[PDB]
Amino acid sequence: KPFVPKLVYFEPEALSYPLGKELYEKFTQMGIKIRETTSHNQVRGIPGETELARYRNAKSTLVVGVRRTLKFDSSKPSAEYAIPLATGCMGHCHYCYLQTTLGPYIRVYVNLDDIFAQAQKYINERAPEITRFEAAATSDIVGIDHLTHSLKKAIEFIGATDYGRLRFVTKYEHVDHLLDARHNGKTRFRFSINSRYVINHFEPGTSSFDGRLAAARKVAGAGYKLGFVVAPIYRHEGWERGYFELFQELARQLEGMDLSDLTFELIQHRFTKPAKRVIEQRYPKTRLDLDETKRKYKWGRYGIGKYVYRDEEAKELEDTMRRYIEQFFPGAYVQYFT
Ligand SMILES: C[C@@]1(Cc2cn([C@H]3C[C@H](O)[C@@H](CO)O3)c(=O)[nH]c2=O)CN([C@H]2C[C@H](O)[C@@H](CO)O2)C(=O)NC1=O
Numbered sequence: 001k002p003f004v005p006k007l008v009y010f011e012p013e014a015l016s017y018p019l020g021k022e023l024y025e026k027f028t029q030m031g032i033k034i035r036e037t038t039s040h041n042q043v044r045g046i047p048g049e050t051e052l053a054r055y056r057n058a059k060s061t062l063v064v065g066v067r068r069t070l071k072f073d074s075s076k077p078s079a080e081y082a083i084p085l086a087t088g089c090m091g092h093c094h095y096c097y098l099q100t101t102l103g104p105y106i107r108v109y110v111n112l113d114d115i116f117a118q119a120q121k122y123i124n125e126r127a128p129e130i131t132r133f134e135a136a137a138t139s140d141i142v143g144i145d146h147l148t149h150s151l152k153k154a155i156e157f158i159g160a161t162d163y164g165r166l167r168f169v170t171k172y173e174h175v176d177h178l179l180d181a182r183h184n185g186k187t188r189f190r191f192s193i194n195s196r197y198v199i200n201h202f203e204p205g206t207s208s209f210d211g212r213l214a215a216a217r218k219v220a221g222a223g224y225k226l227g228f229v230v231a232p233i234y235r236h237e238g239w240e241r242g243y244f245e246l247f248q249e250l251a252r253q254l255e256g257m258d259l260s261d262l263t264f265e266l267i268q269h270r271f272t273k274p275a276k277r278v279i280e281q282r283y284p285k286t287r288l289d290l291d292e293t294k295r296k297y298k299w300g301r302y303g304i305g306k307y308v309y310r311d312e313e314a315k316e317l318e319d320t321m322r323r324y325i326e327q328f329f330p331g332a333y334v335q336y337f338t
């Protein structure tokens, strides 16, 4: 059930680090097909004759490498920065924004000393103000972590700092190895949730809603700060009742738990102009409605723009989500709607 790659690439430089050495001996012991990248770290020869084939096989391929870009991206509204522990995902969410943000093997970085050292510099440059880090900005870091334990190390590193905070969101239940981690109350452990329609139709290759909630109870019992990310908020047929049933069912599955300091994050479905065509050839018979005529185009600033719902329909979603959260989780804090 936990993700295990069917193909692994190693950057030569990765073998100079403890994690690279450990992963090399791990995957060779497991008899998994292991390859070397070029001297300039390019991944060549991923199986597949069509574009869709190489996309599928890429999502079953792991690349063990070194993070050379030590400048951290900003990650608002979640956190000040994105801490780069991994890139890519094993899941096949039809709407996924990684389809345009990438183009899709799973990359993991081994130079944790360097990455954490850089994280500490960002913390020092803003202290005594709090600096939050998003570890799942460009990947499902939790779904990958049983292989590496990099997130666990990041959790404990952040736990040792005074002004640092960590956060990440996942669609996977494979969190057992993280339960005895010394988080020190400085990690927000979030789970992506959605209506039954969106999960059943658009989220294959992820854990079930029940699995995610089972995992959510485990992490909360281990003392982690708990939160949920309701995204993508998607106006499907019967969305108002669909999302009502979500929060009702969510409240039922978290019965008899300390839900003080529970957070919610709300993201409406969004897609870029290229995504329409890219998704059409990566998921041909998807029910995902990418009709531009029912959307508002929000023009980009430094990046490319994207379609979102019109201001009025967006407010319907926001007001509705806020109403259900207040009904089923009194005192819970909605961090943002975007
Ligand atoms: C898990 C995320 C992390 C995140 C990612 N990203 C990056 C990931 C990728 O490079 C890009 C996707 O448009 O945006 C970002 O800018 N801000 C974030 O807060 C995901 N998102 C993203 C996706 C959305 O387009 C953007 C704007 O809120 O933020 C978010 O709102 N909440 C989060 O907590």
Ligand SMILES: C[Se@@+](CC[C@H](N)C(=O)O)C[C@H]1O[C@@H](n2cnc3c(N)ncnc32)[C@H](O)[C@@H]1O
Binding pocket: 089, 095, 096, 097, 098, 136, 137, 138, 139, 140, 141, 169, 170, 171, 191, 192, 193, 229, 230, 231, 232, 233, 267, 268, 269, 270, 271
């Ligand atoms: C890219 Se996701 C990375 C973390 C992890 N693999 C996870 O799925 O939780 C970050 C969040 O953003 C949502 N999301 C993904 N695509 C979109 C989208 N196109 N529109 C609107 N939201 C989109 C996902 O449901 C997640 O809640």
Ligand code: SF4
Binding pocket: 088, 089, 090, 091, 092, 093, 096, 097, 098, 138, 139, 140, 171, 206
């Ligand atoms: S689990 Fe997250 S990162 Fe992975 S395909 Fe789904 S939305 Fe994308």
